[PDB]
From a paper:
Before the glycosidases can act, the terminal glucosamine of HS must be acetylated by the integral lysosomal membrane enzyme heparan-α-glucosaminide N-acetyltransferase (HGSNAT). We find that a central pore within each monomer traverses the membrane and controls access of cytosolic acetyl-CoA to the active site at its luminal mouth where glucosamine binds. A histidine-aspartic acid catalytic dyad catalyzes the transfer reaction via a ternary complex mechanism.
Acetyl-CoA binding then fully opens the pore and positions the acetyl group at the active site located at the luminal mouth of it in the priming state. This configuration of the substrates binding and the active site is the structural basis for the transmembrane acetylation reaction. In addition, N286 is positioned 2.7 Å away from the carbonyl oxygen of the acetyl group, which stabilizes the negative charge in the intermediate state. The ligand(s) bound structures as well as the Apotrans structure adopt similar structures with a dilated configuration where Y361 folds back into the interface and interactions are mostly hydrophobic.
Author numbering:
A (entry chain A): 76 to 171, 176 to 228, 265 to 663
B (entry chain B): 75 to 170, 177 to 228, 265 to 400, 407 to 663
Amino acid sequence: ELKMDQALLLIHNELLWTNLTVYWKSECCYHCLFQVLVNVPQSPKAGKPSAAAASVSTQHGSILQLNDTLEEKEVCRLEYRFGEFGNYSLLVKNIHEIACDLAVNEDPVDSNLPVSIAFLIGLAVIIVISFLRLLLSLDDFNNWISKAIPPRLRSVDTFRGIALILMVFVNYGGGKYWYFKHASWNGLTVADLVFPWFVFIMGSSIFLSMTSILQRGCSKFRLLGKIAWRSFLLICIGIIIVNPNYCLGPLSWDKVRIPGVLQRLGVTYFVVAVLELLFAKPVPEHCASERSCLSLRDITSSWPQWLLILVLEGLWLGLTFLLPVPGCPTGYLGPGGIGDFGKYPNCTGGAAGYIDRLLLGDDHLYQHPSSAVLYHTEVAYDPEGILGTINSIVMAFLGVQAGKILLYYKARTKDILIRFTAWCCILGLISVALTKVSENEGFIPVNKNLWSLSYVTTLSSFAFFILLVLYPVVDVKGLWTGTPFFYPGMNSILVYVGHEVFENYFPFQWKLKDNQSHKEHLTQNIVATALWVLIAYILYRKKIFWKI
Amino acid sequence: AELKMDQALLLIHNELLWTNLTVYWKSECCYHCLFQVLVNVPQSPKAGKPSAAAASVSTQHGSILQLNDTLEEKEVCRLEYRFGEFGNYSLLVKNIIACDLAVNEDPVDSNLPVSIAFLIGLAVIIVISFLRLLLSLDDFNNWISKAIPPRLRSVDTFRGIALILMVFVNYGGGKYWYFKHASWNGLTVADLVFPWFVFIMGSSIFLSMTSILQRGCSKFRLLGKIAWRSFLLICIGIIIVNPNYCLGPLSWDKVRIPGVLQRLGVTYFVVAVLELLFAKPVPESCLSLRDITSSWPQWLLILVLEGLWLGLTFLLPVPGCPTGYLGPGGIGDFGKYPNCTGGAAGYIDRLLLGDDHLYQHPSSAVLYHTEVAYDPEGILGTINSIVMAFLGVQAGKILLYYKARTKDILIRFTAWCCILGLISVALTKVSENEGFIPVNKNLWSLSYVTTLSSFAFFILLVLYPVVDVKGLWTGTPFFYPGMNSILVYVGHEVFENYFPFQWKLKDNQSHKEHLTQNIVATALWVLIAYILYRKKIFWKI
Ligand SMILES: CC(=O)SCCNC(=O)CCNC(=O)[C@H](O)C(C)(C)COP(=O)(O)OP(=O)(O)OC[C@H]1O[C@@H](n2cnc3c(N)ncnc32)[C@H](O)[C@@H]1OP(=O)(O)O
Ligand SMILES: CC(=O)SCCNC(=O)CCNC(=O)[C@H](O)C(C)(C)COP(=O)(O)OP(=O)(O)OC[C@H]1O[C@@H](n2cnc3c(N)ncnc32)[C@H](O)[C@@H]1OP(=O)(O)O
Ligand SMILES: *[C@@H]1O[C@H](CO)[C@@H](O[C@@H]2O[C@H](CO)[C@@H](O)[C@H](O)[C@H]2NC(C)=O)[C@H](O)[C@H]1NC(C)=O
Ligand SMILES: *[C@@H]1O[C@H](CO)[C@@H](O)[C@H](O)[C@H]1NC(C)=O
Ligand SMILES: *[C@@H]1O[C@H](CO)[C@@H](O)[C@H](O)[C@H]1NC(C)=O
Ligand SMILES: *[C@@H]1O[C@H](CO)[C@@H](O)[C@H](O)[C@H]1NC(C)=O
Ligand SMILES: *[C@@H]1O[C@H](CO)[C@@H](O)[C@H](O)[C@H]1NC(C)=O
Ligand SMILES: *[C@@H]1O[C@H](CO)[C@@H](O)[C@H](O)[C@H]1NC(C)=O
């Protein structure tokens, strides 16, 4: 009857001489049009109101505006938040103006109230018990037959493993929860964090591997060849394997999505690694005093790259806020569709979307952006577009900066911690200035689809804080080893390609008894993520590390 | 036009007034099929204006048309014609009743120009493109620099031939009928790879077992390795290879338990454990026959297993079905056994695994219109798969016992090939549908096993001197997949739909485009195997 995250709204219209139409919009919309929910006829006679049934969305908030069909006047307005499976009744009547009362016939399922952390810890206990029993069964079976007859940081690795586990969880569905999906246009969800963290970690590893290779006595040209080959392979693997849905049919060139996650990673890797190789200064030595020296030797040594990154960021800001888009406001950052009151429907992405549609074409972009379900956008927008690559490069260079911090001051963790704290604080201040700590307001609101500058600064401050926490615990104090996380940290590309390839396979996806149940989807996605962690751990035990 | 691939437009118009015509169709290859209706041709309203009809007749191989008056059910005429692909034929029936079937436009051969010189042209194109890709990329790098126990290889070649053929026929084989699995009885090019794979698996079982045991390894560690490999093969087949995940998520009550890799694992376990249990060191000749008497317990057990297969096939009473039924069911055998596909083997696997846990689209479903699910890699045929794996083990025994006696190996290979060919001739009477046990991949018939074993022994007889002794030709396109068989199979199952192997065609009703796509995909899989060989990334177990 009712789908997932969808209540039932019964609308009894007791008025005699007024047609009734009901409009609905979410509270997550910034400026959305009022979609038609249902049209309720007038009551044929007193005491027998006419009723119409509507299925309202539950995920986040709801606004109801009831208007007459004849005169189009506001009868009454509602801002109720509905439950996942409810039988709400909306009675409109003339008590005198007209007073409408909303009644909850059946109480909500109250999603996230029942599962809480109790269900999650129970599922973890169950899977741990099953894994232990499976491990112990091998010994009993064997006995029965026998009776008859530089080193890796591991903080970067734990960070990458956290990102990979979260990415596998949110990519497989994340329980089909709205906060485990990418945000529609603006704001930040759990699924919007992993990709910037992946780019940040990629930049950090770029600096780490490049400086290790250069200090081992390697030529710059061979390293450039390796960088070019890796970027080319990333782009090709993305385009051929990761982007297309091969269950829909054979891959035609006219409908090939050129941009993608791996294409963005390859392009940014090439750009920032080539910048690092062009300006590659050896890691110098400190004063060996530990007396709060606070030397800015890890920024002035890279001012080449800082100047070029600032030029690229200025280019991104100019192309975003200044490039004229035909039939579209200059400097448009909205989602289009019904967003911004539906006056710019074919404007999803503004300048970034325009540049993507111009250079690559509509057919070669992402056909189903995140805004399509909330703002009802019809144009194809690619989150990993062309303008966003500039900010992807900027964040990869911030990750390179983190690697420079943790390599220049490798001797003392005090300097590393202060550098990480200062960078996190500065990036957080920049993000607060840009977005005014607001989801949809601010100069540049946080936006994964546009890869906003505030998106980059917010997620970079998050990654710097994550490093500030993980580096002492995992490395200096050694209190933790990233115990379940670092195996994906070592087999990141294998995990990504595998879960993009084996997404529909049985251990990661099976048929559920109820597909509208959040609990079943969450159980399946958690099991699949745990199985990918298990696969990464098994490969780690076998010393198998696929590297490009 | 509206003509699908392998179809001809048949325009039937009758210049007659006082009879209604219904046209029946029956492909020539089917053994005993009911005449399925094709089209109903009504009376012409008046003389001089025949009433026309349209029908798309299959042109894969032959066609028999039964035109009988639907009012009285008497055949006005019956003609057997080999229609051409994309043809346009006018079956004119009128009083003199005479049927002629004139030709309106010429058909398309679809096989001669596509495989006479098109194959050479495509091979030239692919080798030129590969050379250009390998050279131009390296040309830029060279220009920039200026500015700045051993494997036999005949078994490997045989396995690579089987893998190339399997990749070609699984991907479609150009959608040609002779590159698909035969509808029930008979042999096609696609019906040879799996028995060859089982034969090679048995030969490799013996070679690996002898090497491991002569190296001093214990029998229990080897038994654990056997069990682990069989379990892994079964699990891979069940989880990765069998399901079509493009349809939807996997449910237990709709999962195909049998399969290619499951059967390979079961036969590997049985044959390898038999060899390990009755394991003897190879001794150290013109007329010795020692490699047959040494494995007399295994031969006795294989004879008992074959007798059990014969007894279950020809004596097990299947309810609602004739005993010893080797036919395909459906409209085959005059449609008197509509649900009898496989007979005893189908009954056994339906009773033990259920209709849901079988292959829901048997190869006979298109020709004989069978409605039951029959699994070619079922339960009863696993006995014959074990037998053919043991024949492969015998080939490995021949290879290893007479290692230094090439003439002895050749004599043994030709003797086994001739003996198994004689058995196949006796069982089939050289006939696809006649004989005591006709050749059948779906049933994995005993004569199927013996025919493919004689073929494999002849292949080995031709390959052993050339690739090993005389060194005339290493399996230079073939051993590269031969040493990565499991990777090639699993990858081509997983990446079947991916771009290098599949892309959207200009028209899917074209044998030329499909053949080009499948040959390109097979060549790309050979190239992937060669790349893995060059980097030594042989995946095993
Ligand atoms: C939005 C969603 O929900 S889905 C979006 C998902 N986004 C993604 O980016 C997922 C896919 N991406 C990835 O998996 C990764 O970003 C990758 C594989 C592309 C890049 O991984 P990277 O972080 O660049 O590191 P990778 O493991 O490939 O190794 C690169 C180099 O860094 C080195 N390195 C890695 N970790 C460390 C470490 N902790 N310390 C030192 N060196 C390290 C490696 O040794 C290697 O150098 P080498 O080749 O000279 O030996
Ligand atoms: C019907 C259709 O169109 S599709 C159906 C066809 N598909 C199939 O049959 C599935 C694909 N099959 C296969 O890939 C293979 O048959 C397999 C991998 C499943 C079977 O493995 P095998 O054929 O025995 O070969 P594999 O390469 O795995 O060799 C296994 C052992 O034999 C040894 N071996 C293999 N070839 C040789 C050789 N030429 N000389 C010596 N030893 C050899 C290996 O060393 C290994 O022993 P080890 O563990 O001691 O090292
Ligand atoms: C529902 O009715 C209200 C009230 O009549 C509408 O809001 C006002 O009226 C016009 C449209 O008639 C709006 O454009 C104005 O912005 C509102 N204020 C004033 C002062 O007019 C509302 O637009 C109606 N909703 C729909 C979907 O028709
Ligand atoms: C209400 O809607 C009905 C449509 O069924 C229409 O016939 C009627 O005239 C409407 N009444 C008013 C007051 O608009
Ligand atoms: C909702 O409640 C009304 C009365 O309270 C009842 O008639 C109706 O069947 C209920 N609907 C559902 C889906 O439970
Ligand atoms: C042939 O069929 C047509 C319509 O189906 C019918 O009108 C006619 O009477 C039939 N002729 C004979 C001889 O049955
Ligand atoms: C067509 O009619 C003839 C008349 O003898 C009959 O023998 C034949 O079986 C018919 N074809 C069918 C029923 O398919
Ligand atoms: C087949 O030939 C006839 C000749 O009368 C013609 O009318 C018909 O259009 C042809 N069919 C096609 C598909 O061209």
